[PDB]
Design a protein around this ligand. Sequence first.
Ligand SMILES: NC(=O)c1ccc[n+]([C@@H]2O[C@H](COP(=O)([O-])OP(=O)(O)OC[C@H]3O[C@@H](n4cnc5c(N)ncnc54)[C@H](O)[C@@H]3O)[C@@H](O)[C@H]2O)c1
Ligand SMILES: NC(=O)c1ccc[n+]([C@@H]2O[C@H](COP(=O)([O-])OP(=O)(O)OC[C@H]3O[C@@H](n4cnc5c(N)ncnc54)[C@H](O)[C@@H]3O)[C@@H](O)[C@H]2O)c1
Ligand SMILES: NC(=O)c1ccc[n+]([C@@H]2O[C@H](COP(=O)([O-])OP(=O)(O)OC[C@H]3O[C@@H](n4cnc5c(N)ncnc54)[C@H](O)[C@@H]3O)[C@@H](O)[C@H]2O)c1
Ligand SMILES: NC(=O)c1ccc[n+]([C@@H]2O[C@H](COP(=O)([O-])OP(=O)(O)OC[C@H]3O[C@@H](n4cnc5c(N)ncnc54)[C@H](O)[C@@H]3O)[C@@H](O)[C@H]2O)c1
Lengths: 337, 337, 336, 337
Amino acid sequence: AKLKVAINGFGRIGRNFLRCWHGRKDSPLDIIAINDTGGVKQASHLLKYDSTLGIFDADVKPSGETAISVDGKIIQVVSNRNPSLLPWKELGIDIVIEGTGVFVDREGAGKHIEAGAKKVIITAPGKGDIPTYVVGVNADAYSHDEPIISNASCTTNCLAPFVKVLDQKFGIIKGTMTTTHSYTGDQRLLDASHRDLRRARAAALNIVPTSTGAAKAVALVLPNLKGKLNGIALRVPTPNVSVVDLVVQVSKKTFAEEVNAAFRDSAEKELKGILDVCDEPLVSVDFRCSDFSTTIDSSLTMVMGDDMVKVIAWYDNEWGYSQRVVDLADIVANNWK
Amino acid sequence: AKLKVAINGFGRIGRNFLRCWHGRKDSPLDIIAINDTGGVKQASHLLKYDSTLGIFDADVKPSGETAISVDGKIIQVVSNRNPSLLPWKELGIDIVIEGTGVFVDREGAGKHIEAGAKKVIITAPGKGDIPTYVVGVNADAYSHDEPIISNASCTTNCLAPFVKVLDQKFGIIKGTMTTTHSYTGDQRLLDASHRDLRRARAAALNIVPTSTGAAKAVALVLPNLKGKLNGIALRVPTPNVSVVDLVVQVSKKTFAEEVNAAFRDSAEKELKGILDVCDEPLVSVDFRCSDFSTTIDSSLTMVMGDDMVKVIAWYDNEWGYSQRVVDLADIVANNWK
Amino acid sequence: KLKVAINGFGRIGRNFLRCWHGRKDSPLDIIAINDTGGVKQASHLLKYDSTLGIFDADVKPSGETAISVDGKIIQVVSNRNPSLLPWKELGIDIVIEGTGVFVDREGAGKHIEAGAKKVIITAPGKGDIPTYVVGVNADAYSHDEPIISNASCTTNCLAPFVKVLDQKFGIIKGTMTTTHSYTGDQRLLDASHRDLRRARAAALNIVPTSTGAAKAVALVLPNLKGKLNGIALRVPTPNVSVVDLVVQVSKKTFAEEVNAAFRDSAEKELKGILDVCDEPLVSVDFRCSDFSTTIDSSLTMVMGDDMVKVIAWYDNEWGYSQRVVDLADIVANNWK
Amino acid sequence: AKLKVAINGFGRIGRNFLRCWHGRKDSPLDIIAINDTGGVKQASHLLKYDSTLGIFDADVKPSGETAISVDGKIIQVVSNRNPSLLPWKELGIDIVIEGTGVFVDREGAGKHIEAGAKKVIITAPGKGDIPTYVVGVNADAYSHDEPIISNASCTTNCLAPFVKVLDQKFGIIKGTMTTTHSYTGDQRLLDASHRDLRRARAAALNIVPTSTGAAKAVALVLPNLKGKLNGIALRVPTPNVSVVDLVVQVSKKTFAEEVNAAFRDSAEKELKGILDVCDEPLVSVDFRCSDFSTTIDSSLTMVMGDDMVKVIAWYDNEWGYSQRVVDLADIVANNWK
Ligand SMILES: NC(=O)c1ccc[n+]([C@@H]2O[C@H](COP(=O)([O-])OP(=O)(O)OC[C@H]3O[C@@H](n4cnc5c(N)ncnc54)[C@H](O)[C@@H]3O)[C@@H](O)[C@H]2O)c1
Ligand SMILES: NC(=O)c1ccc[n+]([C@@H]2O[C@H](COP(=O)([O-])OP(=O)(O)OC[C@H]3O[C@@H](n4cnc5c(N)ncnc54)[C@H](O)[C@@H]3O)[C@@H](O)[C@H]2O)c1
Ligand SMILES: NC(=O)c1ccc[n+]([C@@H]2O[C@H](COP(=O)([O-])OP(=O)(O)OC[C@H]3O[C@@H](n4cnc5c(N)ncnc54)[C@H](O)[C@@H]3O)[C@@H](O)[C@H]2O)c1
Ligand SMILES: NC(=O)c1ccc[n+]([C@@H]2O[C@H](COP(=O)([O-])OP(=O)(O)OC[C@H]3O[C@@H](n4cnc5c(N)ncnc54)[C@H](O)[C@@H]3O)[C@@H](O)[C@H]2O)c1
């Protein structure tokens, strides 16, 4: 029997998750329900038409007053803001993909379990006693008896992979980081109220600085990096695809070329499929739909004074993350005891 | 400087309104209250820094604990979602500029009167039987009796002025209209749930067609055009300033240079300070902060088959419309029995 | 089997080669590219496209004077002068002239005046010059024509359904405005330009720009001379445009009648050319469409029984390029 | 006195320079000639209308078919792409503002001298060993017998001022830098021909990596920094205003607060008018028209491990740089032997 999956929050990560899964090969999962404040009208139209991804090459037509049909498969489209009131027990849901961005805390994520679901995966950094995992970095450490887990944030998944390599092979004493990130739906379209007075500013018109937890989050999946990193973010006028700029003071003297090699190795061995060295003089858009969590721009790699390293890595924050979420969902399935 | 004003909803229109007023000489109005759910802190910032208007050149310091000082003017910042509860009777408020876009009908805007306010000017099309005006067109018909009134939409403020001219000097049989408009708060930064599947699409990435009653609305301020006009709107990737494309069939044969000559007459006469004719080959950004609700782009004026006329008009949907809310508010102020 | 040479490896040039590469069995064999920017920049720019996406194939350079696209090998020359182009030495029949410069006989000629026996200007042509819009009057093409124009992306969207309208309601007169994505002609930031409007920052403004498009329709549909006209409105999108046609017909009519008319033609004389969309979509949705003109059904309006307003979507780069790869097919076919 | 000035390359810097100068009071300069490839047509129109600066608050209009008048002051408008053929000897041109970005070496700039002008100020880095200066950092070292000088790049002018403070106050051992920069006229609107395959990609749709010689140009005006810094650039979809993300390893151990304090200190003394510290949460737009070459974003300053400092400074590449160009021209005109 295949694991039954419910998607809470059919937004950007929610919809990228389905389209990722769809393109999967022998998914140990079966998306059978969606939930979101909108009904079939939105859930359907928005899954078929995407300004970022494009039109979904699949049949996406409503399927009755409460469901959509994707290539013959029917998916229940429920619509209740209160997770405690979802047909999870009634639909026999195994894994819930929490993509609302408003149930990332344990008491909130647990509501899904109270409602029937046996497990919940927060598509964002979690709050509370929530184990955090990053595929290719430490998801191997997951345990079947853990009901609620976090897949972290899109920046930690780009950072973690190559921080692992850098630390292991050179020993990261300390470092700082900056992610020039594509704007998200959290910022405003035009100057408007927001708890953060910077995110309140017209998103597509500005370079908007904002904090990030990635630098400190890395320490959750890479214990050794605890207290060593630190960083910020610069939201820029692009709809998707971002880049993280890391500078670390390594313990072992090295050079740009030696560093890029280390990555290419990793790309072939342990981080096979998660990391990827690019040697082409490309640009942001060239990475739309990149299945890699982190792609080093090898030619940008710098080494100042023998031990100060600069590394720029690309990532598609919507797609790349979503794929990762799927990989973690598959991991949670394969450990299903 | 005489009548006490309170601004409900300190969004784009509200703040534009405040700056417009702040710039008038010898004013009937005195702004003493801003209701904003975001608090003094947020109001002070978004008023001072504007991604569209630039830094407001005035000393904007907070005043006391619940007010702000604009060039020495103390303005109270209250904060309640329910208009019925605002300290209007307490502050002595005469006119309320409804700028939330969620209290457009009588019961809605009516709450301000319950609250102690004497009159309400809805900065948007009203719902049901609500007096509607357009300065330069029918604002003189305002009766000091009417407690709640409408200043129509920004597009309706661009048409009426020159449709008044076309229908008068050429008789309008019928026409159609398409307004290439800048995006606005009602659109989504990225594809996301919205009642209008067109508006749910990433604003700064597409050309979004959307309906608009502006066409029909002209029939309220210019009775003669009832049922004669109709149109749509195409939202485009610009933060501010819009253009109206009008095509009317007149009854009196004519040519381009005459139509334009006509518009220039209204400019120096019955439509001074409202209608304007531009002869230089400009672009949208050149019309930022234009005090004219409508500016004809003469070199674009075309006449096909002696009586099918096309007129292209420019307008700052934010600024210009606000200059009009102030004008209507001034009319209300100088007709206070 | 009919040696083709792409002159000007720009948006169209490169969009052209990709559309063609996609054709299941073309009578066209592209043997040479000629741009003012070396082979490397040629292979690279072809492989990665901000608007099209990564070109799914194998675009690796084959030597310092040619590239190997998905097996085949295309020579890549580089000369600012057509006269100096190795057309005879390569045996070119038709040179797709997509540089934007040589758009008249004296200019486009140098190509034929150096080898090629036929040129297809990917834009309007100066004065007396054979113009063709596939699906409207491409049949009138006689092999006698040494040079021909495939019109502009807008005329190819306007001509199709403007025909359907006249043939079914008869256009008395008409006006037209095109909300168009900016293009290479425009400056990135305010900088000198012949056209004071095209000098303004493309991505920051709604830029009014004049166009032939409307009058052009007259050329492909003689029955419209002296009736249509209109301006263009450049907007902050890098691709896809929309034409807003307003015509006064003689035959009293209404919205759904007009649409019904479009839907028929859609699956008859205009299948693959015109299409009717009944979905509340947006510009980006129409990226890579193969129809010169896609009517946005729900936007069709009719005032006073005989004033019709129709909105049609078209990918100004791909859609147009597809027709160029067709007006080439037309040519190849009627080869005497 | 009052040296006669000529502007070569009426581009962004050329036009911003004129407006910067125009706004000065008591200027030792008098701009009396403009050379570009457009003539009075473009010249008048583009000086008046600016999608970035807005409408120039001056009476701009052509004077004859070979000059223009700005507030009555008439300025010649020549048009020859070959400096050698410029009317410098007859116009009595003293100093030339070279902003074509194509005559940036001695053989190039020299052509202006060969044509009559006494001095040349390259509004960009010079090729070879042209005397480079950065106002506030070393422009005082300028010598009257140096015919051709360079005002360095815009990034260098931003970075130089606060690098001067950091090294002076904490001692810079080594550092790396990343400038998220607005796109300029050197990038292409849509994917087109360019020697650089990154800058070839549509500018307003990507984050574009691109080299920068700023990091090492700093060593030119602050010798102690030679060999110690490297860096990269990332062009983003904004029309104007940039930010440099600087990370350095210092000798003296410090903390975020100590660093900012030093900037404010310098800000009020040695770098007065050149450096500023911003304490409010602003975005890129809020910095348009800043006369400072470098404005620190105090709240972003971080220190990791006692001595790895990360500083962020904003700057209007166009307007800011131009203000410094006027300053360098003043400096040149005040040591006129
Ligand atoms: N876009 C990215 O780059 C990205 C990447 C990684 C992780 N994330 C994380 O994913 C989460 C969602 O991000 P997003 O970009 O998709 O945002 P989004 O706005 O597109 O999606 C949120 C969705 O949840 C729905 N929703 C809100 N409250 C709800 C409720 N009570 N019940 C049901 N549905 C509700 C909304 O209608 C919407 O469809 C956040 O935690 C975010 O931090 C985002
Ligand atoms: N943007 C334009 O060009 C424009 C032009 C003319 C008319 N209008 C109309 O003006 C209105 C506002 O438009 P806007 O663009 O300024 O939008 P906006 O989103 O910037 O402003 C709406 C404001 O009202 C506040 N608000 C919402 N509910 C409230 C409540 N119950 N109590 C108090 N404040 C509340 C919001 O938080 C916000 O500050 C709409 O009716 C709109 O149609 C807009
Ligand atoms: N982009 C569109 O949507 C579009 C649509 C339809 C028709 N067109 C027409 O196509 C033409 C080109 O448009 P584009 O968008 O591809 O522009 P573009 O600037 O990208 O392409 C022009 C190309 O020609 C090259 N070129 C210029 N002069 C040359 C010379 N002397 N020799 C060789 N190569 C030379 C350039 O380096 C470039 O590769 C124009 O005539 C335009 O009207 C464009
Ligand atoms: N915009 C910035 O951020 C910036 C900042 C600092 C320094 N700079 C430097 O300033 C220079 C100009 O940059 P810009 O952005 O103002 O460029 P730009 O494209 O806006 O202007 C360059 C101008 O020079 C003219 N020109 C080119 N060749 C010419 C010739 N032979 N004769 C006469 N005029 C000629 C062009 O027509 C144009 O008006 C470049 O060297 C650039 O590196 C630019």
